[PDB]
């Protein structure tokens, strides 16, 4: 929704609309999580929700970093040194639910 913490809301509630463009550099962890702790009138419930949100964000960042690193390492190992009736249900009793009267 709306706010400098909407991303964490989404990551804690819906998580599907959150795109690979959002996750990467939208939120500066060391600043946003720091913002969450002294924020005015924060209920414990919503705080727990936000905790799961920020942890999911961080986990996704880890996933992407691993994927890109693996891609790079696979690249670097390259070089160029030039030197009939088969299965029918038995009759119709399987699927021929009879008409009522």
């Amino acid at each position: 929704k709306r706010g400098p913490l909407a991303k964490i809301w989404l990551a804690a509630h819906w998580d599907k609309k959150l795109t690979k463009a959002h996750v990467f550099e939208c939120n500066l962890e060391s600043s946003v999580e720091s913002i969450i702790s002294p924020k005015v009138k924060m209920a414990l419930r919503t705080s727990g929700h936000l905790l799961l949100g920020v942890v999911r964000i961080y986990h996704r960042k880890a996933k992407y970093l691993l994927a890109d690193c693996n891609e790079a390492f696979i690249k670097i190992k390259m070089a160029f040194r030039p030197g009939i009736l088969q299965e029918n249900d038995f009759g119709d009793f399987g699927m021929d639910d009879r008409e009522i009267m």
Binding site: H13, L44, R45, S47, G48, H49, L51, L52, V55, R56, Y58, H59, A62, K63, L65, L66, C69, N70, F73
Partner: protein
């Protein structure tokens, strides 16, 4: 209360008026209450919630727009309803057990009364993810050395 809808399909089939004439297939229960004090957050004067039930379809209509069975739960949580707690709803002849209950259950009841149950569940869920990112970070350092 969510707890009721944990029954077998037979019970759902048996939870419909089978009195006379034809046999129904689409029962529905609606409740209209007023959050004039804005205890419930969504601003209206008479919030309406109904639960259409059929043999296969189970749906929540909140002011004539469909919902997804989770948004409504978090909404009711925010209102103050505890969707899973037997507390403040006492079935006929089942009050005595709240006194002769073993201690641990009463502690869980009190912990919920404090409003620290959802936080506990979310933290318990988050710990696993944390451990898996630890494994991931180990792998990343390995690959950097390579």
């Amino acid at each position: 209360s969510d707890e009721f809808s944990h029954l077998r399909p037979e019970q759902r089939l048996a939870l419909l008026h089978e009195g006379t004439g034809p046999r129904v297939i689409s029962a529905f229960v609606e409740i209209i209450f007023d959050n004039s004090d804005n205890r419930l957050p969504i601003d209206k004067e008479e919030v309406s919630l109904r639960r259409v039930i059929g043999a296969k379809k189970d749906q929540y209509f909140l002011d004539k727009k469909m919902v997804t069975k989770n948004d409504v739960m978090n909404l009711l949580e925010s209102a103050g309803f505890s969707r899973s707690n037997p507390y403040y709803i006492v079935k006929q002849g089942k009050i005595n057990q709240m006194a002769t209950a073993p201690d641990s259950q009463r502690l869980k009841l009190l912990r919920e009364v404090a409003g620290t149950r959802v936080y506990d569940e979310r933290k318990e869920e988050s710990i696993s993810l944390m451990k898996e990112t630890e494994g991931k970070r180990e792998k990343i350092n390995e690959l950097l050395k390579y």
